[PDB]
Design a protein around this motif. Structure first.
Motif, PDB file in Angstrom:
ATOM      1  N   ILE A   3       0.782  -1.234   0.000  1.00  0.00           N
ATOM      2  CA  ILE A   3       0.000   0.000   0.000  1.00  0.00           C
ATOM      3  C   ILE A   3       0.814   1.285   0.000  1.00  0.00           C
ATOM      4  O   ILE A   3       0.254   2.373  -0.077  1.00  0.00           O
ATOM      5  CB  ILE A   3      -0.987   0.051   1.191  1.00  0.00           C
ATOM      6  N   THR A   4       2.130   1.157   0.073  1.00  0.00           N
ATOM      7  CA  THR A   4       3.008   2.315   0.070  1.00  0.00           C
ATOM      8  C   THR A   4       2.735   3.280  -1.083  1.00  0.00           C
ATOM      9  O   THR A   4       2.647   4.488  -0.877  1.00  0.00           O
ATOM     10  CB  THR A   4       4.482   1.896  -0.021  1.00  0.00           C
ATOM     11  N   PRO A   5       2.630   2.760  -2.319  1.00  0.00           N
ATOM     12  CA  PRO A   5       2.367   3.643  -3.463  1.00  0.00           C
ATOM     13  C   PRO A   5       1.077   4.438  -3.271  1.00  0.00           C
ATOM     14  O   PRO A   5       1.017   5.629  -3.563  1.00  0.00           O
ATOM     15  CB  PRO A   5       2.273   2.670  -4.638  1.00  0.00           C
ATOM     16  N   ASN A   6       0.048   3.762  -2.772  1.00  0.00           N
ATOM     17  CA  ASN A   6      -1.254   4.384  -2.530  1.00  0.00           C
ATOM     18  C   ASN A   6      -1.143   5.489  -1.484  1.00  0.00           C
ATOM     19  O   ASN A   6      -1.743   6.556  -1.637  1.00  0.00           O
ATOM     20  CB  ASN A   6      -2.242   3.324  -2.059  1.00  0.00           C
ATOM     21  N   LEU A   7      -0.383   5.227  -0.423  1.00  0.00           N
ATOM     22  CA  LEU A   7      -0.199   6.213   0.638  1.00  0.00           C
ATOM     23  C   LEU A   7       0.559   7.416   0.100  1.00  0.00           C
ATOM     24  O   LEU A   7       0.216   8.561   0.393  1.00  0.00           O
ATOM     25  CB  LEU A   7       0.571   5.607   1.818  1.00  0.00           C
ATOM     26  N   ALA A   8       1.594   7.155  -0.691  1.00  0.00           N
ATOM     27  CA  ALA A   8       2.383   8.238  -1.262  1.00  0.00           C
ATOM     28  C   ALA A   8       1.485   9.106  -2.142  1.00  0.00           C
ATOM     29  O   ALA A   8       1.603  10.334  -2.136  1.00  0.00           O
ATOM     30  CB  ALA A   8       3.550   7.679  -2.071  1.00  0.00           C
ATOM     31  N   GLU A   9       0.578   8.476  -2.882  1.00  0.00           N
ATOM     32  CA  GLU A   9      -0.329   9.232  -3.745  1.00  0.00           C
ATOM     33  C   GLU A   9      -1.335  10.042  -2.930  1.00  0.00           C
ATOM     34  O   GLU A   9      -1.646  11.187  -3.274  1.00  0.00           O
ATOM     35  CB  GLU A   9      -1.071   8.294  -4.713  1.00  0.00           C
ATOM     36  N   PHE A  10      -1.847   9.443  -1.857  1.00  0.00           N
ATOM     37  CA  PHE A  10      -2.812  10.126  -0.985  1.00  0.00           C
ATOM     38  C   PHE A  10      -2.109  11.355  -0.388  1.00  0.00           C
ATOM     39  O   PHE A  10      -2.674  12.455  -0.356  1.00  0.00           O
ATOM     40  CB  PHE A  10      -3.306   9.163   0.110  1.00  0.00           C
ATOM     41  N   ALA A  11      -0.859  11.178   0.038  1.00  0.00           N
ATOM     42  CA  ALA A  11      -0.097  12.285   0.595  1.00  0.00           C
ATOM     43  C   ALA A  11      -0.021  13.462  -0.378  1.00  0.00           C
ATOM     44  O   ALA A  11      -0.232  14.611   0.016  1.00  0.00           O
ATOM     45  CB  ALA A  11       1.313  11.825   0.978  1.00  0.00           C
ATOM     46  N   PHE A  12       0.263  13.189  -1.649  1.00  0.00           N
ATOM     47  CA  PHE A  12       0.359  14.275  -2.629  1.00  0.00           C
ATOM     48  C   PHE A  12      -0.989  14.913  -2.922  1.00  0.00           C
ATOM     49  O   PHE A  12      -1.092  16.136  -3.059  1.00  0.00           O
ATOM     50  CB  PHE A  12       1.007  13.776  -3.933  1.00  0.00           C
ATOM     51  N   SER A  13      -2.025  14.086  -3.018  1.00  0.00           N
ATOM     52  CA  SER A  13      -3.369  14.599  -3.283  1.00  0.00           C
ATOM     53  C   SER A  13      -3.780  15.546  -2.158  1.00  0.00           C
ATOM     54  O   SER A  13      -4.285  16.641  -2.405  1.00  0.00           O
ATOM     55  CB  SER A  13      -4.374  13.446  -3.365  1.00  0.00           C
ATOM     56  N   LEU A  14      -3.545  15.121  -0.918  1.00  0.00           N
ATOM     57  CA  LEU A  14      -3.900  15.936   0.236  1.00  0.00           C
ATOM     58  C   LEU A  14      -3.070  17.218   0.269  1.00  0.00           C
ATOM     59  O   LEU A  14      -3.616  18.323   0.380  1.00  0.00           O
ATOM     60  CB  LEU A  14      -3.704  15.136   1.524  1.00  0.00           C
ATOM     61  N   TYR A  15      -1.751  17.077   0.158  1.00  0.00           N
ATOM     62  CA  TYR A  15      -0.859  18.230   0.176  1.00  0.00           C
ATOM     63  C   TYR A  15      -1.246  19.264  -0.865  1.00  0.00           C
ATOM     64  O   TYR A  15      -1.385  20.452  -0.552  1.00  0.00           O
ATOM     65  CB  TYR A  15       0.591  17.806  -0.079  1.00  0.00           C
ATOM     66  N   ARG A  16      -1.395  18.814  -2.109  1.00  0.00           N
ATOM     67  CA  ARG A  16      -1.752  19.713  -3.210  1.00  0.00           C
ATOM     68  C   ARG A  16      -3.093  20.402  -2.996  1.00  0.00           C
ATOM     69  O   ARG A  16      -3.315  21.505  -3.489  1.00  0.00           O
ATOM     70  CB  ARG A  16      -1.739  18.941  -4.534  1.00  0.00           C
ATOM     71  N   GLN A  17      -3.973  19.740  -2.251  1.00  0.00           N
ATOM     72  CA  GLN A  17      -5.289  20.277  -1.939  1.00  0.00           C
ATOM     73  C   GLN A  17      -5.079  21.451  -0.989  1.00  0.00           C
ATOM     74  O   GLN A  17      -5.524  22.571  -1.243  1.00  0.00           O
ATOM     75  CB  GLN A  17      -6.134  19.196  -1.261  1.00  0.00           C
ATOM     76  N   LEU A  18      -4.368  21.172   0.097  1.00  0.00           N
ATOM     77  CA  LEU A  18      -4.071  22.167   1.107  1.00  0.00           C
ATOM     78  C   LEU A  18      -3.256  23.322   0.549  1.00  0.00           C
ATOM     79  O   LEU A  18      -3.439  24.469   0.956  1.00  0.00           O
ATOM     80  CB  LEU A  18      -3.326  21.514   2.270  1.00  0.00           C
ATOM     81  N   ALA A  19      -2.357  23.029  -0.385  1.00  0.00           N
ATOM     82  CA  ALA A  19      -1.520  24.076  -0.957  1.00  0.00           C
ATOM     83  C   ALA A  19      -2.341  25.067  -1.776  1.00  0.00           C
ATOM     84  O   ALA A  19      -1.992  26.246  -1.863  1.00  0.00           O
ATOM     85  CB  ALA A  19      -0.420  23.462  -1.816  1.00  0.00           C
ATOM     86  N   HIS A  20      -3.431  24.592  -2.370  1.00  0.00           N
ATOM     87  CA  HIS A  20      -4.292  25.455  -3.176  1.00  0.00           C
ATOM     88  C   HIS A  20      -5.016  26.496  -2.317  1.00  0.00           C
ATOM     89  O   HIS A  20      -5.223  27.632  -2.749  1.00  0.00           O
ATOM     90  CB  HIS A  20      -5.306  24.613  -3.950  1.00  0.00           C
ATOM     91  N   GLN A  21      -5.399  26.110  -1.105  1.00  0.00           N
ATOM     92  CA  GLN A  21      -6.087  27.034  -0.207  1.00  0.00           C
ATOM     93  C   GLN A  21      -5.166  28.206   0.132  1.00  0.00           C
ATOM     94  O   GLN A  21      -5.169  29.230  -0.553  1.00  0.00           O
ATOM     95  CB  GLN A  21      -6.512  26.309   1.070  1.00  0.00           C
ATOM     96  N   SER A  22      -4.377  28.046   1.190  1.00  0.00           N
ATOM     97  CA  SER A  22      -3.444  29.082   1.616  1.00  0.00           C
ATOM     98  C   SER A  22      -2.056  28.830   1.041  1.00  0.00           C
ATOM     99  O   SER A  22      -1.752  27.736   0.568  1.00  0.00           O
ATOM    100  CB  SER A  22      -3.346  29.128   3.145  1.00  0.00           C
ATOM    101  N   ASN A  23      -1.217  29.856   1.097  1.00  0.00           N
ATOM    102  CA  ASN A  23       0.144  29.767   0.595  1.00  0.00           C
ATOM    103  C   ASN A  23       1.023  30.469   1.609  1.00  0.00           C
ATOM    104  O   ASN A  23       2.231  30.602   1.417  1.00  0.00           O
ATOM    105  CB  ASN A  23       0.239  30.465  -0.758  1.00  0.00           C
ATOM    106  N   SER A  24       0.402  30.902   2.701  1.00  0.00           N
ATOM    107  CA  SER A  24       1.106  31.617   3.756  1.00  0.00           C
ATOM    108  C   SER A  24       1.305  30.803   5.023  1.00  0.00           C
ATOM    109  O   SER A  24       2.293  30.986   5.738  1.00  0.00           O
ATOM    110  CB  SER A  24       0.351  32.899   4.089  1.00  0.00           C
ATOM    111  N   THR A  25       0.370  29.905   5.309  1.00  0.00           N
ATOM    112  CA  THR A  25       0.479  29.077   6.503  1.00  0.00           C
ATOM    113  C   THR A  25       1.375  27.870   6.262  1.00  0.00           C
ATOM    114  O   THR A  25       1.563  27.438   5.128  1.00  0.00           O
ATOM    115  CB  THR A  25      -0.891  28.569   6.956  1.00  0.00           C
TER     116      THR A  25
END
Length: 362
Positions: A3-25
């Protein structure tokens, strides 16, 4: 492993989601703690509700059998909560269900059996008292590091989920506190701010990757983990963020080559708190949070839904053999501006943490 590949992908999906919101925090979370929690939760859900969840965690069910999924999370859990081994990691997940609901034993079993997690019953009739219990559970769980996590609960809340993680691991090779000193950290192209900067001259697993257009540093933690820091070139931050992939990371983890460099790394402590209903919702996981939620695996005759889900991730970085270093001008690599980082558990290679530091003194 599987499941490592899946987790790595979830990590990027989540990160990129959060990055779209704020860019200061400062973004900071645990892909592994979040995923493990909802994978566990799915055990009490069926049909649509159940599939949105695993798919929301980047698992393609048409390809990977559910047994393999839960099996992966279980071997990963064994690793993280191994008695004998280090890491100095504190994490947990708490399910709080309304008293009065008739729970299905099997669910409670696998939660405390397979995912070795915790399930509690509380009187949501008293909202203020309920979140005091929940928050006390977290506070006690983190030795008081994480306090008053949940700030509110709507009144009709009958099921709540809390996921927390705190990491303060030690370096395999330490920094000298006497060398740590205040330096400017560039928050803007023309603005600067002072922060405590750890520094060292030695042989480091470091290199400037051209595909990421940034410096890449890997440092091992006492135990079975490695931190990866990405310092993007002037104006290459989001290029960095979009270019990250699992294979690229695997590659860095494979490399053993070291070289001399004078390193400047900020001594810091950052936290990240997120509303999972809001965040995972943007990832397609909304059913389990709605009135149509199918949680017949948790309670049979009564309707149920997850009305509260919160994640908190805390990280502390500080100063925490004989080397051989050539007398040639070493590159000076200063993490004195926004950078990205990843924490990888060495055994499974799963992404323990992921974040972005835009302002250490935030």
């Amino acid at each position: 492993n599987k499941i490592t590949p899946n987790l790595a992908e979830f990590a990027f999906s989540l990160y990129r989601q959060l990055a779209h919101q704020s860019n200061s925090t400062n973004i900071f979370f645990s892909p592994v703690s979040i995923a493990t929690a909802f994978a566990m939760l799915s055990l009490g859900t069926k049909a649509d509700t159940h599939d949105e969840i695993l798919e929301g965690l980047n698992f393609n069910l048409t390809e990977i059998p559910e047994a393999q999924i839960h099996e992966g999370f279980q071997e990963l859990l064994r690793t993280l909560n191994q008695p004998d081994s280090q890491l100095q990691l504190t994490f947990g997940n708490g399910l709080f269900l309304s008293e009065g609901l008739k729970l299905v034993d099997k669910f409670l079993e696998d939660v405390k059996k397979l995912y070795h997690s915790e399930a509690f019953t509380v009187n949501f009739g008293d909202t203020e008292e309920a979140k005091k219990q929940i928050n006390d559970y977290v506070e006690k769980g983190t030795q008081g590091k994480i306090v008053d996590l949940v700030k509110e609960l709507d009144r009709d809340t009958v099921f709540a989920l809390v996921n927390y993680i705190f990491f303060k691991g030690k370096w395999e090779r330490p920094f000298e506190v006497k060398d740590t000193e205040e330096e400017d950290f560039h928050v803007d192209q023309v603005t600067t701010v002072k922060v405590p900067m750890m520094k060292r001259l030695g042989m480091f697993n470091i290199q400037h990757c051209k595909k990421l257009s940034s410096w890449v540093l890997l440092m091992k933690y006492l135990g079975n983990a490695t931190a990866i820091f990405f310092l993007p070139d002037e104006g290459k931050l989001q290029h960095l963020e979009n270019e990250l992939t699992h294979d690229i990371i695997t590659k860095f983890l494979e490399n053993e080559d070291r070289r001399s460099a004078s390193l400047h790394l900020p001594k810091l402590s950052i936290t990240g708190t997120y509303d999972l209903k809001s965040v995972l919702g943007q990832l397609g996981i909304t059913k389990v949070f709605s009135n149509g939620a199918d949680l017949s695996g948790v309670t049979e005759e009564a309707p149920l839904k997850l009305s509260k889900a919160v994640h908190k991730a805390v990280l502390t970085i500080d100063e925490k053999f004989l080397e051989a270093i050539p007398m040639s001008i070493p590159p000076e690599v200063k993490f004195n501006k926004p950078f990205v980082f990843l924490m990888i558990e060495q055994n499974t290679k799963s992404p323990l943490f992921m974040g972005k530091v835009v302002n250490p003194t935030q």
